[PDB]
Design a protein around this nucleic acid. Structure first.
Lengths: 50, 81, 141, 48
RNA sequence: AGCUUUGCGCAGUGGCAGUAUCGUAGCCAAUGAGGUCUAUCCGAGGCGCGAUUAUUGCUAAUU
RNA sequence: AAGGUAAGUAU
């Protein structure tokens, strides 16, 4: 009740502290794994003869 | 104290070198971007209810919710008490 | 729940459905005091800004505005219905009732996905869209 | 009946016994091949 | 008289990368921006916001 | 008892 009308008006607005990158990040592209992974996986199955 | 303008060739008093250079190299792309921004924020319809409508809705909620508000406690949906 | 716009008579609901030509008119039928409606309205409030490009959300009290109770079978604590260009867009949620969402959701992304699917299907000119998620079960384990 | 997964997993105790026997056999074969200055072939370590 | 250095333009050829390029009548900044290493030493932009197919145009198809 | 409705345009 004792909050004056000036105090009521002087209430600040809430501003976000996160920057542009945090709030609205650019779309994160998804890419396939490099072919070296398949190459090394198929090389893993290879075994010596001695 | 007149210094020749490197961008226009005219003479400006030295009290206005930095401001003249900053304004002189101002991209019109800034002007069109600002005009676009002004057009966007002055044409989007408000999504949330106005303040008086929020207050009226909260008053109706308090009237119909006596398990939270009021003195006497009626059922969850009833308004008599 | 109280931050959303409210419609106070059937004519207002009709005008809100008629006014929007390029956005889905999401209207929640229920009571601001019902806990299920409180949950649904909180979910709708969390997404109201996000979907404002292709959806508008209104709340209607079925006691203050009983003009659609018999028509739309609004005899559930909470009900969410979708309209696009003066046409009620049904959705195949897998619940057996394809006309409305009669429960309260908990995921904002769920409701956003449903709104987006309704928007796309209605833009293509379809009266029924298939929900990306089935609701024949609550997936509780 | 569809096969049960247990019938095709060798128990730990039998597998440890087999490991001991197999590695003793491999040690014997390796020592034999050293005497011939020969490298163990895949066919030598076939039953193992 | 040739030769040659630096900076600025204007073009030509060629190479490389599109998780990046810009915009700043927003703010701060050699009266010091920003400092994990080298600190009685380093020395230049930083931040916020906005644009976008992580620069933008035409052209050709399908439409 | 349900979670099993195509959305239609014509007659």
């Amino acid at each position: 009740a004792e909050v004056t009308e000036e105090e009521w008006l002087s209430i600040p607005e809430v501003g976000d502290a996160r920057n542009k990158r945090q709030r609205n990040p650019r779309y994160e592209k998804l890419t396939p794994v490099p072919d070296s992974f398949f190459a090394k996986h198929l090389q893993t199955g290879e075994n010596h003869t001695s | 104290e007149y210094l020749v303008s490197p961008i226009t060739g005219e003479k400006i008093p030295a009290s206005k070198m930095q401001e003249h250079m900053r304004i002189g190299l101002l991209d019109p792309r800034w002007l069109e971007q600002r005009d676009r921004s002004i057009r966007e924020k002055q044409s989007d319809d408000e999504v949330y209810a106005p303040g008086l409508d929020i207050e009226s809705s909260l008053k109706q909620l308090a009237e119909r919710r006596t398990d939270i508000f009021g003195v006497e406690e009626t059922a969850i949906g009833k308004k008599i008490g | 729940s109280y931050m959303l716009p409210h419609l106070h008579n059937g004519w207002q609901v009709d005008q809100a459905i008629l006014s929007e030509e390029d956005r889905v008119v999401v209207i929640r039928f229920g009571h601001d005091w019902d806990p299920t409606c409180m949950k649904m309205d909180e979910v709708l409030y969390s997404i109201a800004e996000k979907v404002k490009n292709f959806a508008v959300i209104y709340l209607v009290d079925i006691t203050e505005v009983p003009d659609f109770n018999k028509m739309y079978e609004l005899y559930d604590p909470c009900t969410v219905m979708f309209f696009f260009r003066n046409k009620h867009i049904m959705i195949d949620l897998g619940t057996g009732n394809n006309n409305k969402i009669n429960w309260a959701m908990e995921d904002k992304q769920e409701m956003v996905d449903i709104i987006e699917t309704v928007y796309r299907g209605a833009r293509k000119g379809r009266g029924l869209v298939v929900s990306p998620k089935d609701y024949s079960t609550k997936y509780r384990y | 009946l569809i096969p049960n997964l247990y019938r095709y997993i060798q128990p730990w105790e039998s597998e440890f016994i087999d490991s001991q026997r197999v590695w003793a056999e491999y040690a014997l074969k390796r020592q034999e091949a050293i005497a011939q200055n020969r490298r163990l072939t895949l066919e030598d370590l076939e039953d193992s």
